[PDB]
Amino acid sequence: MTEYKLVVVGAGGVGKSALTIQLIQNHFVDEYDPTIEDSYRKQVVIDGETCLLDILDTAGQEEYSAMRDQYMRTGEGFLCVFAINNTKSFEDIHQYREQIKRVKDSDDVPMVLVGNKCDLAARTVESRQAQDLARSYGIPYIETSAKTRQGVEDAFYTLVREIRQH
Amino acid sequence: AHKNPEMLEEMKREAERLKAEVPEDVVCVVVRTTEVSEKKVVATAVLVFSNKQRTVIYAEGENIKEVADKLIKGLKKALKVRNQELKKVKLVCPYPMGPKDKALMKELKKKLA
Ligand SMILES: Nc1nc2c(ncn2[C@@H]2O[C@H](COP(=O)(O)OP(=O)(O)NP(=O)(O)O)[C@@H](O)[C@H]2O)c(=O)[nH]1
Ligand SMILES: [Mg+2]
Known part of the structure; x- marks a missing residue:
């Protein structure tokens, strides 16, 4: 099996x-519990190959920003997440x-x-704006909903496939 | 201050060593307490689980009881969401067991069974 280190980063x-x-659990949390650092492991089958996804959930708050260097050194793939109803969070992607x-x-x-x-x-970031940002980065852009599970598998597996192209 | 990243990294390295020592199924926790004023008891916990998983939990209480309640709630949440159950635990405060570290440990070990 192949091990993929993913890091999920973005604004709080x-x-x-x-x-x-x-x-991980096919469950949606409706409570806002701010994170500091969380580690999860998931066995998945992507494109016929058995992968172990080591997912690292980071802290979006301005605090614990000194821990960024270590995990930005260890992780192989990065999910840069913003909220379509949060313009500032979209503007925060460039710093990460x-x-x-x-x-x-x-x-x-x-x-x-x-x-x-x-x-x-309550959309304040249109799809084409994030598309332009992603094109500048040369990376895919995917819309997801943790509430309805829409795009979650697509986002994570696309990150795995992007790791594959290296 | 009370949220020193260097402190956190030291606690994580210690907890990694603890997990490497004791068998895999046992969760390893490292807890620290900051007594900010008297209604600002802040607790920091670092938890290492069996399948090479980790989490960091905070609690802002006014007494040791509220801090312990929040700690245990976070523990149970991080167990259930990782599809794991409580086998055994071990709580250490590496260097300065001080104003409320020992009392917090006594309360944590009390709320075990
Ligand atoms: N409608 C909707 N709400 C969502 C969605 N994803 C998250 N939320 C809401 O957003 C809240 C905060 O989500 P959370 O995952 O904690 O955000 P976070 O990036 O981890 N914050 P932090 O970086 O501080 O830990 C949740 O309580 C939930 O109700 C989504 O896709 N749709
Ligand atoms: Mg969070």
């Missing part, structure tokens, strides 16, 4: 923990992307831009 409240918990780029010392870092909370109608 965008739903990183909700997405990870939805993927630049930190990953400088720590990895590479422009080609496996990443997927994730627009979470697509089930909500």
Whole structure:
């Protein structure tokens, strides 16, 4: 089996923990419990190959931002998550992307831009804006909903496949 | 301050060593207490589980009882959401067992069975 190290990063409240918990347990959390650092392991079959996904849920708050360097050094793939109903969170993606780029010392870092909370109608980040951002990064953009499970498997498995292209 | 990242990293390294020592099925926890004022008891816990999984939990209480309640709730949540059950545990405070570390440990070990 093949082991893939994924790191889920983004601004606080965008739903990183909700997405990870939805993927692991097929359950949606409606409570906001701020994260510091969480580790999950999941056995999955992607494209006929048995993978162990080691998912690391990071903290989106301004605190515990000194722990970024270590996990941005260890992880292989990165889910950069923002909320379509949070313009500021979308504007926060560039800081994470630049930190990953400088720590990895590479422009080609496996990443997927994730627009979470697509089930909500209070959209302030249009799909084409995130598409333009992703095109500048040269990475896929996928909309997900941790509430309805829409796009969660797509986002995670696309990140795995992006890791595969390296 | 009370949320020192260097402190956190030290607690995680210690907990990793603890998990490497005791058998795999046992959860390893490292807890620290900051007595900010008197109504600002802050507890930090680092937890290492069987299948190479980890979590960090906080609690902001006014007494040791509220802190322990929040700690145990977080423990149970991080067990259920990882599809795991409580086999056994071990709580250490690496260097400065001080103003409320021992009392917190006594309460945590009390709320076990
Ligand atoms: N409608 C909707 N709500 C969502 C979705 N994902 C998360 N939420 C809501 O957002 C809240 C916060 O989600 P959470 O996963 O904790 O965000 P976070 O990125 O982990 N925050 P932090 O970085 O501080 O730990 C949850 O309580 C949940 O109700 C989604 O896809 N749709
Ligand atoms: Mg969270």
